[PDB]
A paper describes a structure:
Factor XI ([name]) has an important role in thrombin generation in the amplification phase of the coagulation process. Inhibition of activated [name] (FXIa) should decrease thrombin generation in the amplification phase, but not in the initiation phase, and thus yield an antithrombotic and profibrinolytic effect with minimal risk of bleeding (see reviews). To improve crystallisability, the quadruple mutant (Ser75Ala, Lys78Ala, Thr97Ala and Cys123Ser), first reported by Jin et al., was generated. The mutated residues in this construct (FXIa CD) are located at least 16 Å from the catalytic residue Ser195 and the alterations are therefore not anticipated to impact ligand binding in the active site.
In parallel with the fragment hit identification work, compounds 9–11 from patent applications from Bristol Myers Squibb were synthesized and characterized. The compounds are potent FXIa and plasma prekallikrein inhibitors and selective against e.g. thrombin and FXa as seen in Fig. 6. The crystal structures of 9–11 in complex with FXIa CD were not available in the public domain and were therefore solved by X-ray crystallography. Given our aim to target the prime side, it was exciting to note the S1-S1’-S2’ binding mode for all three compounds, as shown for compound 9 in Fig. 7. None of the designed linked compounds, 20–24, reached as high potency as compound 10. However, compound 20 with an IC50 of 330 nM, suggests feasibility of including reverse amides in expanded structures. The crystal structures of compounds 9–11 in complex with FXIa CD gave a clear handle on directed expansion of fragments towards the prime side and allowed linking exercises.
Residue numbers in the entry: 16 to 37, 37A, 37B, 37C, 37D, 38 to 48, 51 to 59, 59A, ...
The structure:
């Protein structure tokens, strides 16, 4: 997260850190708890991942330093990637992880609500991006979970900033014209969370951008409301 600040324990309890163990254990991507056995994340996180056995999901984490060999984690039973997905920049950048065991909800770990199709006209004014990603294009994975409040921009605006791409209706963009606050490397798969009528909604999944926090280059996110039917179908199995 560029231009953000350290979060406090318990303020983003749907946020998880997904680790891979191959070739060695490290943070791979963010994710969001959406059900007792279900993490929603980005499809692009699973490049080269041939088995769910190498994945570990850690919940209730503020600092990566909390994760040692003796720290509890959730195993992954199955990775479900959208069948139209090919790469992040062309969309369908969404995936589900079915956990091996169930998350017992607490103030440290609880699900975020999905957006409603009836809310497509809602102007979300209180949106936050979170994660352990770089704080500059060249930086490193953060110990402490970061947060930044970032304004949504219209898809029409976003398209003008990425004329070499197609910004689709299943994408949503966020950023300042002058830059300075954005997701960055290591934040992908995590949530863009918007508070509306005193409830947090999972509006976006951190997906891609050209550089981090650059002038006239908003961050691009998977537009979650455009996938609620897909999420339902896949979780009903
Ligand atoms: O995490 C991201 C974020 C990309 C991104 C998203 C938005 Cl909304 C706006 C700008 C973005 N960036 C553009 N250039 N950098 N960020 N991307 C992942 C892509 C990816 C994930 C998994 C597998 C392959 C590729 C990444 O680089 N992740 C990442 C994770 C860890 C490290 C890392 N560094 N040191 N140790 N681990 C570096 C990069």
């Amino acid at each position: 997260i560029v231009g953000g600040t350290a979060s406090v324990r318990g303020e983003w309890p749907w946020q998880v850190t997904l680790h891979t163990t191959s070739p060695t254990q490290r943070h791979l991507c963010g994710g969001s708890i959406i059900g007792n056995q279900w993490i929603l994340t980005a499809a692009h996180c699973f490049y080269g991942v041939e088995s769910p056995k190498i994945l570990r999901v850690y919940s209730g984490i503020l600092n990566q330093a909390e994760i040692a060999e003796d720290t509890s984690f959730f195993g992954v039973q199955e990775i479900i990637i959208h069948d139209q997905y090919k790469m992040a920049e062309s969309g369908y950048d969404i995936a589900l992880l079915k956990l091996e065991t169930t998350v017992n909800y607490a103030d440290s770990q609880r699900p975020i609500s999905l957006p409603s199709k009836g809310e497509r006209n809602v102007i979300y004014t209180d949106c936050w991006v979170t994660g352990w990603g770089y704080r500059k294009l060249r930086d490193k994975i953060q110990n402490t979970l970061q947060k930044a409040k970032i304004p949504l921009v219209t898809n029409e605006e976003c398209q003008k900033r990425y004329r070499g791409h197609k910004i689709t209706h299943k994408m949503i963009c966020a950023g300042y014209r002058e830059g300075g606050k954005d997701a960055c490397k290591g934040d992908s798969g995590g949530p863009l969370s918007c508070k509306h009528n005193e409830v947090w909604h999972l509006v976006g999944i951190t997906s891609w951008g050209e550089g981090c926090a650059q002038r006239e280059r908003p961050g691009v996110y998977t537009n979650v409301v455009e996938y609620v039917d897909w999420i339902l179908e896949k979780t009903q199995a």
